[PDB]
Symmetry: C3
């Protein structure tokens, strides 16, 4: 793993966090408790602040960055799939970002919302809490069911465990 | 090059296989002879079985993973383009996956099929063998001319050559 | 950072160029003065020549490659966003390729053109200089305003400086 400062700012990573290999984190970045950053993921906090909560999982090959004056916020329990681009996005508690998705500047993903795989959420777009949105540009296609919420809950719990397991293996 | 075991399962890589730098391979994964896994690709076998045939090429920055109970099967001679996401997908012999595509769960890609760049094959979708499928979601547009099929044999064979060449350089 | 020669040709990189960690560059590749190749980017020059001008920035997780007899050309001042796939593209002076885009074989991006995020420019497609192209397939929708051009100027100016800043930390 690579850690780099930027103009006097360095990442603040919880001790329980898992930082996979070939990951790069730089600048003004805060990573919460039990959160896991998977393989080859890049997080450059050299434009605006980046705050990632607890028990969050940033899956493999993702890119997190920002545009001027637009902080990147990822609250507790969030799941972000493989190869996702988060650019100054605001991702509220428990949301899930489908793999291969691009979440643009100031777009706000509602609490518990689910973004389908391969979607593009345009600048400033707000996705209502607990809904399913997908497409390019992403549109809400329906609100979530209790079965969807159960699986989202299962996914983030699973990843907390996998992160701890891989963290151990890193010996 | 990073190899990790996962819960009792450890990657089994053929001797003639080329595993590029910054590649990560974990758990229940099996890689065949003469296949090449290119730069930054991530293959996490921690959800379900992953089997990769012989003479296969998985190009740069790809992500291979699985959903529960859905193995990831990639038969012989398959060409996986740059930065592709394969999730519990079943790719039949000699098929070609265009760069930037996303093949989702239980989606089966028929033998000799050609998935156009930037495509997204939805969960459970079956793609007829010997056909060309494009779009998001991918739709079959036509059949492959003998010329197409020969360009695929040319690519497939070419990557076995490059695979062994870079493998030599590595050493 | 990995630097590999290919079939007797080794990458020629200006001394002022910044090459981030986990970057892989091989073969027939020329990188100009002060350009910055960001984290996890892959530049494989093993099929056709690749020439990258000066003060260019290739952002994190991008992949540059070619098709037979189709050189990959990127002139001075070009900005290519995160996770971009450039395959035998001809990118003219000062153009900007939005993050998550796929620019295909023989496609040419006119001087100062701006490709919107997540776009796909099909093979052979030509984008007029100083225009905004969006979508998949991408389509020209309008012309760039005066401060759109001003912003583009600001962008490549910061990356030239940011690359030099990170370059120093690297040492
Ligand atoms: Mg950026
Ligand atoms: Mg997965
Ligand atoms: Mg290629």
């Amino acid at each position: 793993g690579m850690i780099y400062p930027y103009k006097g700012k360095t990442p603040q990573i919880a001790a329980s966090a898992f930082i996979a290999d070939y990951v790069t984190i730089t600048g003004d970045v805060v990573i919460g408790e039990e959160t896991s950053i998977w393989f080859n993921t890049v997080i450059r906090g050299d434009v605006a602040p980046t705050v990632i909560g607890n028990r969050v999982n940033i899956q493999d090959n993702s890119i997190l960055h920002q545009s001027p004056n637009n902080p990147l916020i990822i609250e507790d329990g969030v799941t972000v799939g493989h190869q996702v681009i988060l650019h100054s996005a605001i991702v509220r508690k428990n949301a899930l970002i489908g793999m291969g998705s691009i979440i643009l500047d100031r777009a706000e993903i509602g609490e518990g919302a689910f973004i389908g795989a391969g979607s593009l959420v345009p600048p400033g777009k707000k996705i209502p809490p607990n809904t399913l949105a997908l497409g390019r540009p992403a549109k809400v296609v329906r609100e979530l069911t209790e079965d969807d919420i159960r699986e989202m809950e299962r996914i983030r719990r699973e990843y907390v465990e996998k992160g701890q397991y891989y963290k151990a293996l890193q010996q």
